[PDB]
Write a protein that binds this ligand. Structure first.
Ligand code: CDL
Ligand code: SF4
Lengths: 216, 56
């Protein structure tokens, strides 16, 4: 069990399960600890109700995105293993399990990494994939080989040193990792790549075009 | 070829056709013995994405 799950247990027993179920949406009961980091004025750890909207939480506790809410580019709401969501989704999304699963992300561990428009999103996702490359136990073939493969492909994507077709192949590579591993590290390495390909493909294609024209 | 014109006329009359138009010997209309390199396209299943082998 997680430290938070056991830690909240004595309070749940003393005050009752109904009091804890009073907070949050149905099947998403209780309070939660949110770690808001990244490009926010006041990154911090706070306690809040489960189904608080993301925008309200960021503007209330974290002090808002650096340069105003209109500067926001992307949010990773559940730590590195959850796919990112763009600004158009972070407008009316609630911070529970089901609401974030609907947005194709998942709440995970409630770690909100905020990125504004002053960031190289591909570089950030590549750094996350490199982290997953360096933390693979190397037991099963899918994770052990495909995470390094995806790290190489993403590192080449950062420079724009590929062709657009590779994008689709990269997607399929992710599908060959997710669901075929021993533990969920393979899924957690495949998901951010899928989110990036899903929401920022024009950026990748434009970077490849720029590299192609610059290098002839 | 290089035959004398009178011999050419004799051949044309004897055969009944104009042999100078179509000669069995090849002189200079054949391809050069040295050619530029080719490029040789790949094929249909050289895709990177929608190319799972169990579907072909
Ligand atoms: C019959 C009379 C004799 C003259 C003769 O044969 O001329 C044929 C002469 C040659 O015509 P052709 O063989 O069709 O032309 C090919 C080139 O001339 C081919 O010319 P070339 O560059 O190869 O030169 C080869 C040359 C040198 O070759 C030789 O020295 C060996 C041939 C000697 C044979 C004896 O041939 C000759 O000088 C001798 C020709 C025959 C005379 C004997 O044609 C005629 O004059 C027709 C005359 C009437 C015939 C009906
Ligand atoms: S998916 Fe899990 S078990 Fe498989 S290699 Fe990666 S860390 Fe090891």
């Amino acid at each position: 069990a997680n430290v938070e799950t056991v830690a909240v247990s004595p309070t749940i027993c003393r005050r009752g399960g109904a009091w804890f179920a009073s907070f949050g949406r149905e099947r998403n009961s209780g309070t939660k600890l949110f770690n808001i980091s990244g490009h926010v004025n006041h990154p911090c750890t706070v306690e809040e109700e489960m189904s608080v909207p993301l925008k309200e939480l960021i503007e209330k506790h974290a002090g808002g995105v650096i340069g105003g809410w209109d500067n926001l580019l992307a949010v990773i709401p559940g730590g590195s293993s959850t796919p990112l969501i763009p600004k158009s989704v972070c407008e009316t999304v609630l911070m529970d399990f089901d609401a974030l699963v609907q947005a194709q992300t998942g709440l995970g561990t409630a770690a909100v990494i905020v990125m504004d428009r002053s960031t190289d999103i591909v570089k950030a996702i590549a750094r996350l994939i490199e982290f997953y490359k360096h933390e693979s136990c190397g037991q099963c073939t899918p994770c052990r080989e495909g995470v390094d493969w995806m790290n190489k492909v993403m590192a080449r994507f950062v420079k724009g040193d590929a062709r657009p077709a590779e994008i689709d192949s990269l997607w399929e590579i992710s599908k060959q990792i997710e669901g075929h591993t021993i533990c969920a590290l393979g899924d957690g390495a495949a998901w951010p790549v899928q989110g990036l390909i899903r929401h920022f493909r024009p950026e990748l294609e434009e970077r490849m075009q720029q590299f192609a024209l610059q290098h002839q | 070829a290089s035959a004398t014109r009178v011999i050419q006329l004799l051949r044309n009359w004897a055969s009944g056709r104009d042999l100078q138009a179509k000669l069995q010997l090849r002189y200079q209309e054949i391809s050069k013995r040295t050619q530029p390199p080719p490029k040789l396209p790949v094929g249909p299943s050289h895709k990177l994405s929608n190319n799972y082998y169990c579907t072909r």
